Amino acid sequence: QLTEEQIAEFKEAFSLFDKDGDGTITTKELGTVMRSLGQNPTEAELQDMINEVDADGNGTIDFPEFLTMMARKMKDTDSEEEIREAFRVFDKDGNGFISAAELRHVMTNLGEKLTDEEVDEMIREADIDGDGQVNYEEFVTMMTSK
Amino acid sequence: GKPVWAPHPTDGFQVGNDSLTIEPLFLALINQVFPAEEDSKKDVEDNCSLMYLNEATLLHNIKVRYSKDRIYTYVANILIAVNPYFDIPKIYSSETIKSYQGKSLGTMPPHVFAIADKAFRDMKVLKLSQSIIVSGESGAGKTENTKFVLRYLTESYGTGQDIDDRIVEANPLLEAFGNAKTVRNNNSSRFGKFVEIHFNEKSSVVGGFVSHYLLEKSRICVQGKEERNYHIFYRLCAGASEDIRERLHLSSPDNFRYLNRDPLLDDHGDFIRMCTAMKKIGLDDEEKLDLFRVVAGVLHLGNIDFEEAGSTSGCNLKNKSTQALEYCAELLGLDQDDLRVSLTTRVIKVPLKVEQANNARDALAKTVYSHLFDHVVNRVNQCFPFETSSYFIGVLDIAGFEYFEHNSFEQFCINYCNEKLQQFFNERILKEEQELYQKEGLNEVHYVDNQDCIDLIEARLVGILDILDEENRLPQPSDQHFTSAVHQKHKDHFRLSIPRKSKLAIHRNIRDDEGFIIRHFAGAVCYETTQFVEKNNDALHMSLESLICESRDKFIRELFSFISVGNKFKTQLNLLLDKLRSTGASFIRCIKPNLKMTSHHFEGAQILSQLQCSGMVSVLDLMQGGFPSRASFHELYNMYKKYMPDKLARLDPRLFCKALFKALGLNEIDYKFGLTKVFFRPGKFAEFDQIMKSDPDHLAELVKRVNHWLICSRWKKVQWCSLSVIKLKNKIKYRAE
Ligand SMILES: [Ca+2]
Ligand SMILES: [Ca+2]
Ligand SMILES: [Ca+2]
User: Fold this and answer.
1) Full domain range(s) for residue B714
2) Are residues B480 and B360 part of one domain?
3) Which residues of B does the annotation place in the binding site for ATP?
4) Which domain covers residue A81, as residue numbers?
5) Best mutation site among A40, A144, A145, A146 for testing chain B: the one with the most B CBs within 10 Å?
6) CB contact under 8 A, B721 and A13
7) Chain A, window 95-114: residues with a beta carbon less than 8 angstroms from a chain B beta carbon
8) Where does this protein hold ATP (chain B)?
9) Cβ A106–B731 below 8 Å, yes or no?
10) Same domain for B233 and B319?
11) What are phi and psi of B308, to 5 degrees?
12) Residues A37, A57 within the same domain
């Protein structure tokens, strides 16, 4: 039910959950990554969600199961509100632009390791209109870039 | 300038630099020289982690591991298991048994437990019975390795109960009637044993079942020098009480045609130990004696001789055989005269010549013993019955590929058996590679199978077996006429040649009609065909058959080349294959490190021969058709980060490898980025290594070109991860209201 391009993009995102690259995720990594981006799932909420797609039943789900777990019957432009919510995770002060400091916070929450200048580089790259920050339009453009 | 591996008569291979000349640290044929691993000190748990996967690098790797007492190495999901020849401490510890539980293959070090856990895991998830196929010559550690699989399964997924120790108790009964001494092994198994551990609907152990196949019938009457009949015969003759010895009219085995002639063979003691084990099993003196009666009956049968008398032709029993005949008739519960008529005539009463009566005697002997073995395996199965089951996990043990200076029909059948098992081995490895590639997000592996060698043997009408049947059906069957028929019908066959073309001087004196060479998976075998026609015929005529079926002895009644030996062998081989094909399969290959049973000795050339006979060489060739080398991202991060700017070294292992390959412009045909590993076509890991070791400056340049891509990859990773988290949050709320 996804494009080849969406599957590819989610595949790299899965590597942030699956740090040691064994191809499988447990309740622990699911929980850790969600909380680091400001969510608060219960252990039972995570288990119930995993059991629903865990074929083995060892409590360890793989990439295609990860995709299924994310799937649900969706309203028109619910996805669009999802993208706006993803943006608000970066735009912490809610003024509509992502700053260096804010990108750094997310990169840090997710365990990414980079230099202050690398963060600035990332800002510069997605900052089409050159006001020094990343707005929503630029965000989505970067997000769906080829 | 690269170190290659070249043939070495005693180590198989040695390092050095139509054919080629090699300097060690010597003329050699091109196709026997293999690329070596750069780091000779190195060691990997999966030989698919090497840059070159070939017989040489494989042999070198498991050697290195052997020294560190690392006896278990993988090739993909295939386990190589070299006999340590001493008890490596705590590796079969109960603790270790728990550390392997539910662990995916290759998250723990290589171990028979993992093979074992995987079978259970697939059984449980896929709801499909499983088979574990073990290979290996005598002294390879095959018996111990089987124990471990069973022990593991029972302590891990049994319920306190103890089926393994039960199977372990019952086994001495199988060995008595099913094993015999050979030229290469004093206690060789002569049938196919599929020891099944059965499971209930919730994947808990609930019983055992020993399936059995292809008992070697010819041994019952005839053996070669250095060989003996089945153990039981000699044990009984040397161990029975002076009483039993009298009732069954036993005596020295030298007094029975059916028993050819060794001090280390303790028949007296093994008989005592055997009875000891029989009692532990719940085998009372009654069925014990019932077993011994048939055994003796067959021994006396075999002593009945015949001669021509001129009796309005037909032959008769030598009067000297009168006693063997009454003894045999007595022990088999038959009328002495009925038996006599049915051994020297067939039913319209056709008299039989001497040879024909010899064959009637032997045919009866083979059928009776074979039904006795059937019964013996059934009683063993009663030592651990179950009511019902859903699936099983079975370990298959059966004589491996073999050749000698002289090969006859016995080797033919055995090697035919392994030719079909090898086809199965290849098919299932091919399947595993394909599913591995799909599972990793990457392809059909290039492989030509040995169907043609199988068809040479078993094809209808023109196959060797059917041409042999045809000969038996001719007025005066001839081995020579048979052999020529084989050559004339497979004119320009890839797989068949005349002995004159042998790669060995010992075979080139054999005439075209005295033999043939079959190019088997493991190598060419030259068969001498004298006696093929006689060995293809073991048929029991109906009247003699009726006789035994209607024995006064109730036990015997309960035991019960128109159809040739070759054809029955095929039929039985096919039943075993039917069973295997219904399961998911895994393979263990046991290796005998040397002859002397000694620790820390690695006979290169001798282990190499075993690798070949087990079909491992055949399997590596097959793997060259796909992606034979594969390495985790973390592993490649570790190896190569030092060659790249510090910028790349900051990335995580997956993104580091992504960046590397993007910057080198590595085509996506030869290099494949999976979910957990990078996969390489043959030669390509090595190529990638060279690139990595080339001019550091041009290298840092290529990275620059990738800078935009790298930044966009960094964004998309966290952006799509944020989106994932948001979908997971929306999913929890979905599942709620
Ligand atoms: Ca993980
Ligand atoms: Ca902001
Ligand atoms: Ca901007």
Assistant:
1) 694-737
2) no
3) 136-143
4) 75-144
5) A145
6) yes
7) 106-107, 110, 112-114
8) 136-143
9) no
10) no
11) -80, 135
12) yes
